[PDB]
Design a protein around this ligand. Structure first.
Ligand SMILES: CCCCCCCC(=O)OC[C@H](COP(=O)(O)O[C@@H]1[C@H](O)[C@H](O)[C@@H](OP(=O)(O)O)[C@H](OP(=O)(O)O)[C@H]1O)OC(=O)CCCCCCC
Lengths: 39, 121
């Protein structure tokens, strides 16, 4: 009786998806917030 | 790519007309203005036209220059009359919404490459 091993796709996704989401949030906020004119 | 094509003569001894046609973005709702840059001076506001056909002019060039906007072909034209020799400079065309501005260059995001104008005595 064998058992399925832990999916490497899920293992690397655990570190990928939050990392991509954080990078996207950083780029989005940085490029959009400091956009208005100043005196 | 947003681009503003300026056209007009370079040398004059006089009256002149300089046109500025927009492309890649409709500026019917934006404010379209003209600026001047002489050698060794900062940008000076000449004139501006608003969505409501409303005209603003600088004091130094009030009563001489005339600004018009053609919304159909999406362009702003400036008619220069009564030139005097120290008006030689490169003229820039800009379009944008006036925030903190309508007279300051910093309020405009779109600018032309500039057209040189020289007056000979
Ligand atoms: C986020 C994507 C990351 C891709 C990382 C890709 C990393 C990669 O190397 O492939 C993983 C994936 C298999 O995924 P998974 O790791 O879950 O499969 C295990 C293992 O990889 C072998 O397939 C099996 O061994 P065997 O063969 O029976 O000897 C093993 O069987 P068992 O342990 O139960 O006995 C499985 O548990 O293979 C693809 O088809 C690629 C589809 C990619 C499509 C990607 C579409 C997004």
């Amino acid at each position: 009786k064998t058992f399925n091993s832990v999916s490497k796709i899920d293992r690397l996704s655990r570190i990928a998806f939050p990392l991509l989401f954080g990078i996207f949030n950083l780029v989005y906020w940085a490029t959009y917030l400091n956009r208005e004119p100043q005196l | 790519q947003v681009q503003l094509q300026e056209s007009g003569g370079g040398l004059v001894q006089g009256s002149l007309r300089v046109s500025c046609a927009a492309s890649g973005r409709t500026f019917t709702t934006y404010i379209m203005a003209w600026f001047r840059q002489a050698p060794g001076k900062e940008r000076e506001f000449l004139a501006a036209m608003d969505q409501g056909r409303i005209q603003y002019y600088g004091d130094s060039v009030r009563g001489r220059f005339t600004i018009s906007r053609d919304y159909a072909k999406n362009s702003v034209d400036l008619q220069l009359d009564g030139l005097r020799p120290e008006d030689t400079a490169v003229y820039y065309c800009a379009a944008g919404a006036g925030f903190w501005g309508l007279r300051t260059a910093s309020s405009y995001h779109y600018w032309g490459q500039g057209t040189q104008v020289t007056v000979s005595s």
